[PDB]
Structures are given as structure tokens and as C-alpha cells.
């Protein structure tokens, strides 16, 4: 079941040694444990999620989200509704 609340940034997007990105998100909604809504948009990209299907284990919990973002300009959407978090990423 999908999370339906506010997800704030705990630690910002960062490139890893193994050429991937990681975000650490705090979940501020209810219904937790729940699947974290993750969208990778281009300038909708499929199967670029490295992490094992991310979940918000409890409210106030932090979650590591490993992605393989496309080259260049990409947009990561964490969550749903007007509380969704759109993140702009650039990959060289």
C-alpha cells in the first residue's frame, strides 16, 4: 500500500562511488509502514530504481532511495498530491 503523506528531505540527493544517487527522506504522514511513491521523469523513466522497493517503516522514519537517474536533466517525484516532492537532478 502507497504512502499518502508529506515526505521531507533528510539528506539531499547525492552521487555514489558506484555511479548511482541516494536520497534520504523523512516520512511525515500516516498509514506507515507503506510503499514510498517514486517517479523518475525526463525532460517517465522506467526501472531506474536500484533500492529494494522502498518503504516508510513508521512515521518520522528516514528511507535511503537508490536510483540510476537518466543522463542529464531528470526530475524525481517523491510522494503524491500537492505535498509531493519534485527534485531536479543533473547527471554528467
Amino acid at each position, epitope marked *: 500500500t502507497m504512502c499518502s503523506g508529506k515526505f521531507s528531505i533528510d539528506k539531499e540527493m*547525492a*552521487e*555514489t*562511488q*558506484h*555511479g*548511482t544517487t541516494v536520497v534520504k527522506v523523512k516520512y511525515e504522514g500516516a498509514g506507515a509502514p507503506c510503499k514510498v511513491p517514486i517517479e523518475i521523469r525526463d525532460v517517465k523513466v522506467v526501472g531506474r530504481i*536500484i533500492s529494494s522497493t522502498p518503504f516508510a517503516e513508521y512515521t518520522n522514519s528516514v528511507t535511503n532511495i*537508490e536510483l540510476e537517474p537518466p543522463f542529464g536533466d531528470s526530475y524525481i517525484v517523491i510522494g503524491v498530491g500537492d505535498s509531493a516532492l519534485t527534485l531536479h537532478w543533473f547527471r554528467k
Partner: antibody
Amino acid sequence: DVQLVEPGAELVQPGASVKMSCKASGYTFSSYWINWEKQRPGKGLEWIGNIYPGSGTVNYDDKFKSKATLTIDTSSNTAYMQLSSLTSEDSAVYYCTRGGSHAMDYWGQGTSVTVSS
Amino acid sequence: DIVMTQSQKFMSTSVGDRVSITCKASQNVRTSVAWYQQKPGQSPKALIYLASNRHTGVPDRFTGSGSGTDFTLTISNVQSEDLADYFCLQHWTYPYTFGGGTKLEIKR
């Protein structure tokens, strides 16, 4: 010519903390990740975690979260690992290495830490 | 966490013979597998990067093969200097995990 200079050995008291250095040279330091590994005698290798000079980006292996602190001094091209509240489980050979998407390539000489009063 | 299973703990080979050091991944790590040579009382030396690619200044005796879960390091024409500890490492995802190690003995 890549060179990661690591002090040979360090004698630490139980419960005390140690700061060990890894002096890089021979390459663009601020453009490669630094790795740190643990090697207990007759036992295998363990990945402590990694640092990125050109951003200060850190990744730790949860096993070492409360134990290791990875700092970097770009002005001295030295990478550091601080191990805290030492126990005999911490007596091991600590390595530092250059990182990339090819991983470890050039390993330093390793500090042989010994925990005893 | 991914577990690198280097089953071969000890291996004896006469100079000139062929040896195949196996490594098994707990899950699909793709090709993000490196091999290292650790000669007694020395730092590990990088041999193979990304499962099959030999590093600079590594003899063509050293060969890497495989993908996913089965990875092998092959040393054809064994030399007296080849006397070391050999290990695989995954860098597919954090935390980076190492093979058990394989102490290669040289038969004489």
C-alpha cells in the same frame, strides 16, 4: 605515481580513540572517492565506508556507524578515519584506497592498530 | 547485504599450471566485481576491474569472467610470484562486500 602513505602501526588503550591518516599523492585528489577497509588477522576484509573529497559526501557501512568518522583535508590531500571507544574487536589492519566506478585500485600500506592497556 | 562466497580457502598449483578461483554473489551484482592480489605482508593489488577487465600492469595470465552471481579469477601459467591471497569484491551497492579470500600455495 599514486601513493597513499599510511602510518605503519598505532598503539591504543581500551576505551580510548584513534585518528589515523591516509596521505594521498600522485593524482587529482579532489576528483576520486576514498575507501577504508578492516582486516583482522587470518580473517577477511570488511568495508568501513567511503568519502568524496570534492563534496565531502560520506557513505558508512552500518556495522561501523557509531565507530568510524571519515573526514578529509584537501589542503594536505590526507584522508582520515577516527575510530572511537576502542575494544579488542578493533585490533586490525586498516586500509585506505582510491575509488571510482572501478572501485579500489590503489591501496595504501595499512595501519596495524593494537588495542591494549 | 550481499555475500561474496569464496569457497576455495586453500589452493596448490605447480608453476606453469592453471588455477580458477571462484566467487559466488548472494544476489545479482551484474559485473561490479573486482579481484585483488594480496602477497604476504603487502597491500592488496588491483588485478581485475568490472568482472572481466584486466588493470594496467597486470599480466595476460590473469583473467576475469562472469556476470550476475558466478565470478571466476583465472591464473594461467602460474608463477612463483603469484603466491598470494586472492579476493573478489562487489561494488554493485553499499555496503561493499569482500570474498572470503583464497590462499594460493605454489607446488614445487
